Amino acid sequence: TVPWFPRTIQELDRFANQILSYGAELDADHPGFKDPVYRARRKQFADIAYNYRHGQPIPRVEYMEEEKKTWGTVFKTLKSLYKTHACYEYNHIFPLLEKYCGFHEDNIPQLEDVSQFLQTCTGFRLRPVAGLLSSRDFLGGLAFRVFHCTQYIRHGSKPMYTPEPDICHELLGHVPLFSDRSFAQFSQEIGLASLGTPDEYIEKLATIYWFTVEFGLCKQGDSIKAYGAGLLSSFGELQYCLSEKPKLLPLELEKTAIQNYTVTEFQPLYYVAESFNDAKEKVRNFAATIPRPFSVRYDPYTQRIEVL
Numbered sequence: 001t002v003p004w005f006p007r008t009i010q011e012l013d014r015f016a017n018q019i020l021s022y023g024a025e026l027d028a029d030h031p032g033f034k035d036p037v038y039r040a041r042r043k044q045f046a047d048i049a050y051n052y053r054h055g056q057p058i059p060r061v062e063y064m065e066e067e068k069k070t071w072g073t074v075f076k077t078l079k080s081l082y083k084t085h086a087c088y089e090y091n092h093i094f095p096l097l098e099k100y101c102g103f104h105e106d107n108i109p110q111l112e113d114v115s116q117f118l119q120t121c122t123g124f125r126l127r128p129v130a131g132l133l134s135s136r137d138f139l140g141g142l143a144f145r146v147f148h149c150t151q152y153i154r155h156g157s158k159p160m161y162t163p164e165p166d167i168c169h170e171l172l173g174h175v176p177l178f179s180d181r182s183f184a185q186f187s188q189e190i191g192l193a194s195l196g197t198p199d200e201y202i203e204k205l206a207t208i209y210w211f212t213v214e215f216g217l218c219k220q221g222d223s224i225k226a227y228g229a230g231l232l233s234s235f236g237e238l239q240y241c242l243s244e245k246p247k248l249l250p251l252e253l254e255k256t257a258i259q260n261y262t263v264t265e266f267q268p269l270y271y272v273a274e275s276f277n278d279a280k281e282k283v284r285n286f287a288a289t290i291p292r293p294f295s296v297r298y299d300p301y302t303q304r305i306e307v308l
């Protein structure tokens with residue numbers, strides 16, 4: 001049989017009912033494990049994602065002073081690096097995010113405003129997500145230019161560290177790239193490649209995503225920069241990834257897709273994308289080798305996936 005996959009953007013709503021119910025915030029070694037207030041705060045954000053439905057505006061939340069502080073620290077220390085470490089598409093859009101979305105040290109931007117802004121850039125939109133989606137559902141959203149975005153923030157005791165995605169990582173890491181046309185199309189190709197795809201291949205697509213969307217390096221003229229969200233949201237690894245220590249290889253999907261990695265230390269290896277259009281092409285070609293007895297196309301006019 002062929003695994004189920006949403007045919008319309010509205011059907012993404014089926015995901016919030018298929019997430020991991022026991023999140024990392026419940027682990028003993030989580031920075032906020034002993035903090036019951038944090039625990040309730042997380043549950044509150046999880047309830048917002050749980051009751052969200054496609055088409056609804058995303059609930060605004062008044063962030064506590066302590067939370068705004070954690071964001072300030074992460075924002076200020078990371079910002080100093082972008083001008084020289086982030087790829088062009090990132091820097092080109094960051095100022096706009098600053099003027100129209102409240103990207104500032106003393107303010108945590110609201111997902112609704114960020115979503116509207118991405119919509120006018122590339123049609124990308126966000127939807128609040130409770131916790132970790134399966135790779136199949138997470139990647140599936142991308143086919144509709146939809147990004148499941150966390151809304152809670154890491155625990156204030158360790159501002160420069162998070163064992164999971166949190167809002168600082170979504171906004172400072174992912175958002176600027178989804179504002180770029182080429183990147184938008186490239187990430188969508190990954191989404192399209194995953195629809196109705198067999199599990200073993202979903203894993204391959206997750207690995208490609210890891211080495212591009214999360215930890216990718218781009219070729220910029222004769223230089224190299226970071227575009228991977230996991231890098232753009234990690235002060236330490238962002239500086240390291242452009243140093244002489246890591247090993248760099250050109251993005252090559254048959255190899256990238258089976259390359260192991262661990263999410264615990266700095267990556268020993270990075271793949272360099274020639275450009276987003278090229279990575280997009282490479283995914284399309286790679287998608288062609290996936291055994292699916294059909295083809296898929298997203299029609300932005302109706303927000304439906306066409307199955308051939």
Ligand SMILES: C[C@H](O)[C@H](O)C1CNC2=NC(N)=NC(=O)C2=N1
Nearest residue numbers: 129131132133134135138206209
């Ligand atoms: C895309 C790849 O499978 C990643 O490991 C995943 C899986 N599920 C996910 N779920 C959520 N909510 N956010 C993510 O960034 C995410 N990334």
Ligand SMILES: [Fe+3]
Nearest residue numbers: 165214229230
């Ligand atoms: Fe991420």
